UniProtKB/Swiss-Prot annotation, chains A, B:
<dbReference type="GO" id="GO:0016853">
    <property type="term" value="F:isomerase activity"/>
</dbReference>
<comment type="similarity">
    <text>Belongs to the nitrobindin family.</text>
</comment>
<protein>
    <recommendedName>
        <fullName>Peroxynitrite isomerase Rv2717c</fullName>
        <ecNumber>5.99.-.-</ecNumber>
    </recommendedName>
</protein>
<keyword id="KW-0349">Heme</keyword>
<feature type="binding site" description="axial binding residue">
    <location>
        <position position="145"/>
    </location>
    <ligand>
        <name>heme b</name>
    </ligand>
</feature>
<keyword id="KW-0408">Iron</keyword>
<keyword id="KW-0963">Cytoplasm</keyword>
<comment type="pathway">
    <text>Nitrogen metabolism.</text>
</comment>
<keyword id="KW-0479">Metal-binding</keyword>
<comment type="function">
    <text>Heme-binding protein able to scavenge peroxynitrite and to protect free L-tyrosine against peroxynitrite-mediated nitration, by acting as a peroxynitrite isomerase that converts peroxynitrite to nitrate. Therefore, this protein likely plays a role in peroxynitrite sensing and in the detoxification of reactive nitrogen and oxygen species (RNS and ROS, respectively). Is able to bind nitric oxide (NO) in vitro, but may act as a sensor of peroxynitrite levels in vivo.</text>
</comment>
<dbReference type="InterPro" id="IPR014878">
    <property type="entry name" value="THAP4-like_heme-bd"/>
</dbReference>
<dbReference type="Pfam" id="PF08768">
    <property type="entry name" value="THAP4_heme-bd"/>
</dbReference>
<keyword id="KW-0413">Isomerase</keyword>
<feature type="binding site">
    <location>
        <position position="27"/>
    </location>
    <ligand>
        <name>heme b</name>
    </ligand>
</feature>
<dbReference type="GO" id="GO:0005829">
    <property type="term" value="C:cytosol"/>
</dbReference>
<dbReference type="InterPro" id="IPR012674">
    <property type="entry name" value="Calycin"/>
</dbReference>
<comment type="subunit">
    <text>Homodimer.</text>
</comment>
Length: 153, 153
């Protein structure tokens, strides 16, 4: 099916991406991971998102998540994500065409023991997909948690 | 990877399923749809769930959803789902081995304009996967909304 007019401004996402990232937070020791993401569509004003991570040396599976990106022509966007760990997120924010960036903050984080808010920011940088994920808890204010850079396959 | 011991009691789900269903509710006219579901795993205590629906005559895409099933040896289970329409659900309940059934009710429905609670019940019937989805709103109590039967491919 053809790309929906609401999806067209984000068409640069469509395809499969692979790279690596790093995680850290006050309570845990820092770690590295591999990551793969696929963005796809079926002609609706929605982009399907699927993701997995693994251990670098062995390729041993770690986590996975999936969901849907819903952009609108005013530059607003909502994103819904379910994670393999048992969490859900409702993310809202904006995308910027000239910068090829997407900036999101959580309206809701569901079924979490400690996590309060999550922010997710994407940017296309020299054709590579970069992101930063920040997270808060009741006692730790919103701060860096994950960052990764992926090449388009 | 081998099937995790927490996933083994639900191994009957693993694979791809295709069939059809019917939807209805006080406010909307009744309708029919085709449906496909895949359940898969990566050796963790988690089953990945992906689903799509279409119009029967043409195969024209309608909706999609995805998420994760997390069963535990005491017979409890939690399920997280993100939908293409922009909703999320946290589902909790129980599974029964002798009946090959799973019964879930929502802890949370996120980003919904009208929906308050959702229940989802699965049963394997002569090797076919059946479900019923019930839904409530502020003014409509929990009641039938979707039902489908799918054959294992």
């Amino acid at each position: 099916p053809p790309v929906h007019p609401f999806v067209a401004p984000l068409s640069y996402l469509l395809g499969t991406w692979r790279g690596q990232g790093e995680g850290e937070y006050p309570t845990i020791p820092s770690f590295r991971y591999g990551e793969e993401i696929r963005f796809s569509h079926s002609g609706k004003p929605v982009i399907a998102y699927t993701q997995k991570t693994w251990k670098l040396e062995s390729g041993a599976p770690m986590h996975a998540e999936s969901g849907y990106f819903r952009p609108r022509p005013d530059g607003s966007i909502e994103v819904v994500i379910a994670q393999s760990t048992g969490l859900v997120e409702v993310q809202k924010g904006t995308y910027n065409v000239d910068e090829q960036s997407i900036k999101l903050k959580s309206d809701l984080v569901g079924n979490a023991s400690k996590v309060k808010e999550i922010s997710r920011e994407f940017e296309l940088v020299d054709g590579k997909l970069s992101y930063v994920v920040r997270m808060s808890t009741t006692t730790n204010p919103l701060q860096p948690h994950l960052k990764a850079i992926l090449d388009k396959l």
